[PDB]
Structures are given as structure tokens and as C-alpha cells.
Specification:
Largest sheet: 8 strands, parallel
Strand content: 5-15%
Bound molecules: N-hydroxy-4-[(4-methylpiperazin-1-yl)methyl]benzamide, potassium ion, zinc ion
Helix content: 25-40%
Distance between the termini: 56 Å
Number of strands: 16
Oligomer: monomer
Number of domains: 2
Length: 640
């Protein structure tokens, strides 16, 4: 399977600029490209990507998305002087032309096609194109908002034609609406377009009625256009994550795309003068991370906007860091989305309830200057994953996993058995030595990121893992338990949150436990994913653990969702996760190690519908927990 990350960039795309006074376009400058590539170099990220050369898009490639009349017109701009270039530009809204912009527009588009080919040919796993001019405002016969040709639209149309793809997802996280992409695919159910964007009740450029949440697509495309308008500025990390957990991700995992393309404008970041939002550069590590289990990791990230040179470089690095599989930064201070964002989210979920199973329960009453801290260092672990199979069993491990007891650790095991345990089963005592050794190599280390240990006795293993973690000290521990019965886990001090997926319906009592009893049958997969995206991840992100403890008891239908969970759960605690598997199951063990190690997750297939019984259970959990954990909210709360 595919390995690295493509980086596509050429200096030539910085060789056009604005040649006259125009306050509407002053902000789009060649330095955006130079600063972003130079920040990737500074952080050692460009050196770790496969450089793929740019090329020109061909005439027939441009005609996939644009009219002969418009291409013929743009083709004449290289021969124009400044007066003619100014006259030509004024025919369009917020765009300038330059003798070299037609050349550069061909390169930005070809650069995007190069990335698609590298990913679809399995030459790389994923990649990013750093291009100018941007694309997503560009239309069939018009330049618009700095865009000449619609780079990302090309990518989807090209991938449809040349790879016979039937489902492509486009995520536009630029702060502006990509109306050029919306128009291109508005009737096409094979391309799912998602956009959030500063809107302010249509007072913000481009000032379009059809940028609102009620534009869902047309004809056979109904439901495959998703607009989330931001009606106030200052949106934060919590607003962006709420948008992902409660709108985009549920639909994207149900759609099950074969390719993901990101219209990656970083004018949605803190400090940007166009966006005026407040999200930290670190959030793009998580927006990237949360999408990577789709389409077997096949993701093409295409630069659009972003005008604060500092804000821009940091966000580009956080994105490539994530494409490279480096550990995600911890996001602190998360909570409820603001009221305007909850209104936008609840309105889009309601209008989309006719088209997506994650929202269908909503349709019937029966079912209800600017500064900020520099991002910290993200170093990939020497060995990413450590595994301790049962004694004897050697396994075929990925190149970045490794088998594991020191004299010091042996003394600690004896101390613990002497005070707290009596037990002499010499292998469930080797268990404890392995748990303590692997945890020490996770926390007080830097060399290892996560690990998986097979165990016999859950209660002493869990207790030893949990207690050793707490005194390390890891401030908070998220525990994810698949199984029944009660663990030696205390949730009465705030330092532990326990998620439990079980078979017997348990009444929860306090707001530090989430207990999900999902029914038996075919819909267990969709129900689990709905719970993961809409309940588990919101709470876990708000909790912000320093360690994730996963626990599976011996008794297998979740063996189809476990990979997605352990991939997504690595967005917490910088990927520091210890998974305890009770008993040897080679498939589950190999899958756990696969996902812990950063390998691609196999797709689920287009998702069925969850049972209404399960959706009712999940929304009762949300109602019970969302006052404590506001990131769970996907509606505006009632005022007194
Ligand atoms: C406040 N207004 C808003 C719009 N603006 C023109 C404009 C700027 C940036 C983009 C873009 O595409 N950014 O990524 C598009 C149009 C002029 C003043
Ligand atoms: K957008
Ligand atoms: K569409
Ligand atoms: Zn933009």
C-alpha cells in the first residue's frame, strides 16, 4: 500500500502580482506561496515529502470545467499591457490579471492534477499542492475572487473521468464560500461539496443567497451540497469541531467517498484579516486528522486562501504534519459552540434531514495586533507503536512497530503485588511488567507514541495501567472499554472519563461516564459510527485527556469499527494510547497495531441506517451530558 506524502510546489506561481491600486485585491500577494513553502522547509516538513513537479493543465483539461469562450479570453491576457489588463480585470468581481497569470493558472491547475494522479496511482498516500492563483470562486465562464480556473473542481472532474470514481468528497474550509465549486456540482450526486464560510446573513462577500444553508443541491444532486454559514465572526476551535462532529463527519462517513479533496484556505485561521475568525493553527491538524480515515487515507489538499503570513505558515505546517502522520497537538479549552454557530448547525442539520441517515431522526416528533502562542513541536516517534503479543507469538509488524522488562520495572511489579495483590500467576504478573514498561516508554519517553498489550486478567491489568498512568502524572485519562461488567475504575474526581460500549443496558448516573448499549444485528456498524462521531469524540475532545486507555474483553461485530475508532481517538493525548486486549485474537491484534501505527484504515462501505432504538439511546445520552460537555450540543439551548 501507498507510503508517503506528496508536496507540489513551484516558485513560478509566485511570479505574478497586482500592478495597480485596488484595495479589494491588495491582500493576494506572491509572498503567500514563498512564506508557506519556507515554513515547511524551516520545520523539516518539505524534506520529508515526495516532491512532485508541477505541469500545465492542457486545453482539454481546462475545458472540463470552463467554457471555450472564457478560456479563449484568458488566453489573450499574456499579450496585454497594464491598461488592457486593468480593463480586462474590471469585467469580473475582485480579481486582477497579469501577463503571467494565465501561465500560473495553468500551473496551479496542473499541479492539482499531478497530486490527484500521485494519490490515485498509489504513488503516495496523500499530499498537498501549494498553488496560486486559488480556484474555488472560479466559474464556468468567469474569474472571481482571485481565482482564474477552478483547481479543485478540475481535480474532481479529472478523477471522475480518469479513475471512474463514483463518490468524491470536497471539503472547503476556506473562510469564503466556494460558489464556483457549488455551481459546478450542484446537480451531481457523485461529488459531495461541504463548505463553511463567513456569511453574516449575506452581508459578507460574495453576498449570495445561495450560500445559505438552504442550498442543498438541485435535481439528482439534492442533498450533496452542504453549506454552513457563519453569521458572526470570531468562530473558535469549538465552533469548527462542532461543525465537524455534528455536520460534516456524519455525512462524510455515510457518503463513504473514494477520494477526498480539500479546498484548504487558511483565511479561516486566527489573525487573518479577511476571515476574522479565532481558530488556532493547531485546529487544521485535527480537521486533517479527522478526515484521513476516509477513502483509505487518499486525500488531496489544495491551497486556496490565507493572508496573514504568520498565521498562514503555521497552519500549512500543522496540515502537512498531519498528512505525514505526526502526532496531533492537544487542543485545550474546548466547550460549547457559540449560539450563532449552534443556530447555523441546527439549521443545516434540519434542512439536510431529508437526505442523510444521521439527521433523519430530526424529521419526526416520534424521534426528536492579533497575537497567539507559537505551536509546540510535533516530532514523530522513533518507534511509533510497541506491541506485546502473548509469549512466543511473533508477528509480522509494520516497519514502525516493535516488540517490547527492566530490573527497575521488575521491582515495581513486586511492590504493587505486595501492597495491592494474593496473586502469583507468573504471566499476569508479566502482564504488569509489560504494561508498566510500555507506559513508561509512552509518557516519560518521547521515543514511543502508543502501544498494545495482550492480557489475561482485566481487573489487575486495568487497575495497574490506570494507576501507573495517574501517578506518572498524566492529569486526565480517557478510558474506552468494549465489554460488560464493572472495571476497577473510579470516575469520582474528574481525572477519568469512562466510555463503555456494552451489551446490557446500564443506567448512567454521573456526567463522567458515557455508556452505550447498542442492539444486535446488521446496524451495529452505523450505530457505532454515529455514537463515535456525535458522542464519543465531542466529549473526548472537551475532556482533553493526557492518555487514552482502550480495553477489549475477550467476547466481535465491532471488529469492523475498531480500526476507525483507534485511528480517530489518536487525535487525543497526542496519540498516546495504550490498548489492552484480553486474550489473543490475531485479527483484532493486527488491526489494532495497524491503526495505532498510522496505517490507512480500510473503508466501511456506504453506511446503512442505524436502528431508531439506538438513535433514541444516543440522543438521551446527549441530553444527559451536554450541559456538562457543551461540545456535544448541536442545537441552541433554551433560555430561562
Ligand atoms: C471584505 N471584503 C471581502 C472580499 N474582498 C474581496 C475578496 C478577498 C478575498 C477573497 C478570497 O478568496 N480569500 O481566500 C475573495 C474576495 C473584499 C472586501
Ligand atoms: K469554504
Ligand atoms: K454535488
Ligand atoms: Zn478565502
Amino acid at each position: 500500500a501507498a507510503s508517503g506524502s506528496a508536496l507540489i510546489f513551484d516558485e513560478e506561481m509566485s511570479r505574478y502580482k497586482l500592478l495597480w491600486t485596488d484595495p479589494e485585491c491588495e491582500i493576494e500577494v506572491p509572498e503567500r506561496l514563498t512564506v508557506s513553502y519556507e515554513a515547511l522547509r524551516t520545520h523539516g516538513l518539505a524534506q520529508r515529502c515526495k516532491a512532485v513537479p508541477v505541469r500545465q493543465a492542457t486545453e482539454q483539461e481546462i475545458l472540463l470545467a470552463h467554457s471555450e469562450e472564457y478560456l479563449e479570453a484568458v488566453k489573450q491576457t499574456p499579450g496585454m499591457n497594464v491598461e488592457e489588463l486593468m480593463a480586462f480585470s474590471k469585467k469580473y468581481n475582485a480579481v486582477y490579471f497579469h501577463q503571467n497569470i494565465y501561465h500560473c493558472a495553468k500551473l496551479a491547475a496542473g499541479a492539482t492534477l499531478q497530486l490527484v494522479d500521485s494519490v490515485m496511482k498509489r504513488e503516495v498516500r496523500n499530499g498537498m499542492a501549494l498553488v496560486r492563483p486559488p480556484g474555488h470562486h472560479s466559474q464556468r465562464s468567469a474569474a472571481n475572487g482571485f481565482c482564474v480556473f477552478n483547481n479543485v473542481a478540475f481535480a474532481a472532474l479529472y478523477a471522475k473521468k480518469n479513475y471512474n470514481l463514483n463518490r468524491i468528497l470536497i471539503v472547503d474550509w476556506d473562510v469564503h464560500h466556494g460558489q464556483g465549486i457549488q455551481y459546478c456540482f450542484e446537480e451531481d450526486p457523485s461529488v459531495l461539496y461541504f463548505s463553511w464560510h463567513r456569511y453574516e446573513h449575506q452581508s459578507f462577500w460574495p453576498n449570495l443567497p445561495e450560500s445559505d444553508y438552504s442550498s442543498v443541491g438541485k435535481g439528482k444532486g439534492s442533498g450533496f451540497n452542504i453549506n454552513l454559514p457563519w453569521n458572526k465572526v470570531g468562530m473558535t476551535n469549538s465552533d469548527y469541531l462542532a461543525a465537524f462532529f455534528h455536520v460534516l463527519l456524519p455525512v462524510a462517513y455515510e457518503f463513504d467517498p473514494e477520494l477526498v479533496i480539500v479546498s484548504a484556505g487558511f483565511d479561516s485561521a486566527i489573525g487573518d484579516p479577511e476571515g476574522e475568525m479565532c481558530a488556532l493553527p493547531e485546529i487544521f491538524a485535527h480537521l486533517t486528522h479527522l478526515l484521513m480515515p476516509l477513502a483509505a487515507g487518499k486525500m488531496c489538499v489544495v491551497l486556496e486562501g490565507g493572508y496573514n503570513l504568520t498565521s498562514l505558515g503555521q497552519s500549512v505546517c500543522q496540515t502537512v504534519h498531519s498528512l505525514l502522520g505526526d502526532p496531533t497537538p492537544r487542543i485545550s479549552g474546548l466547550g460549547t459552540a457559540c449560539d450563532s454557530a449552534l443556530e447555523s448547525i441546527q439549521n443545516v442539520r434540519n434542512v439536510q434531514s431529508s437526505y442523510w441517515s444521521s439527521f433523519k431522526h430530526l424529521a419526526q416528533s416520534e424521534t426528536n495586533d492579533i497575537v497567539w502562542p507559537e505551536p509546540l513541536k510535533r516530532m514523530p516517534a522513533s518507534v511509533r507503536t510497541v506491541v506485546v503479543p502473548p509469549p512466543g507469538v511473533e508477528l509480522t509488524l509494520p516497519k514502525n512497530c516493535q516488540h517490547s522488562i527492566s530490573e527497575s520495572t521488575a521491582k515495581e511489579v513486586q511492590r504493587i503485588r505486595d501492597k495491592h495483590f494474593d496473586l502469583t500467576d507468573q504471566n499476569i504478573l508479566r502482564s504488569l511488567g509489560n504494561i508498566i514498561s510500555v507506559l513508561d516508554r509512552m509518557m516519560r519517553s518521547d521515543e514511543v507514541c502508543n502501544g498494545c498489550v495482550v492480557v489475561s486478567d482485566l481487573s489487575v491489568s486495568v487497575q495497574c495501567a490506570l494507576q501507573h498512568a495517574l501517578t506518572e502524572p498524566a492529569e486526565r485519562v480517557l478510558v474506552v472499554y468494549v465489554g460488560d461488567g464493572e472495571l476497577p475504575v473510579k470516575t469520582n474526581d474528574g481525572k477519568v472519563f469512562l466510555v463503555q460500549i456494552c451489551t446490557k443496558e446500564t443506567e448512567d448516573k454521573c456526567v463522567n461516564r458515557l455508556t452505550l448499549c447498542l442492539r444486535e444485528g446488521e446496524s451495529l456498524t452505523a450505530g457505532f459510527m454515529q455514537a463515535l462521531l456525535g458522542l464519543i469524540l465531542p466529549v473526548a475532545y472537551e475532556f482533553n485527556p493526557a492518555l487514552v486507555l482502550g480495553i477489549v474483553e475477550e467476547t466481535t461485530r465491532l471488529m469492523r469499527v475498531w480500526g476507525h475508532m483507534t485511528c480517530l481517538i489518536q487525535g487525543l493525548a497526542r496519540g498516546r494510547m495504550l490498548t489492552l486486549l484480553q486474550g489473543y485474537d490475531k485479527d483484532l491484534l493486527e488491526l489494532t497495531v495497524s491503526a495505532l501505527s498510522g496505517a490507512s484504515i480500510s473503508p466501511l462501505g456506504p453506511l446503512r441506517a442505524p436502528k431508531p432504538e439506538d438513535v433514541e439511546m444516543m440522543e438521551k445520552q446527549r441530553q444527559r451530558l451536554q450541559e456538562r460537555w457543551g461540545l456535544l450540543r448541536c442545537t441552541v439551548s433554551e433560555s430561562w
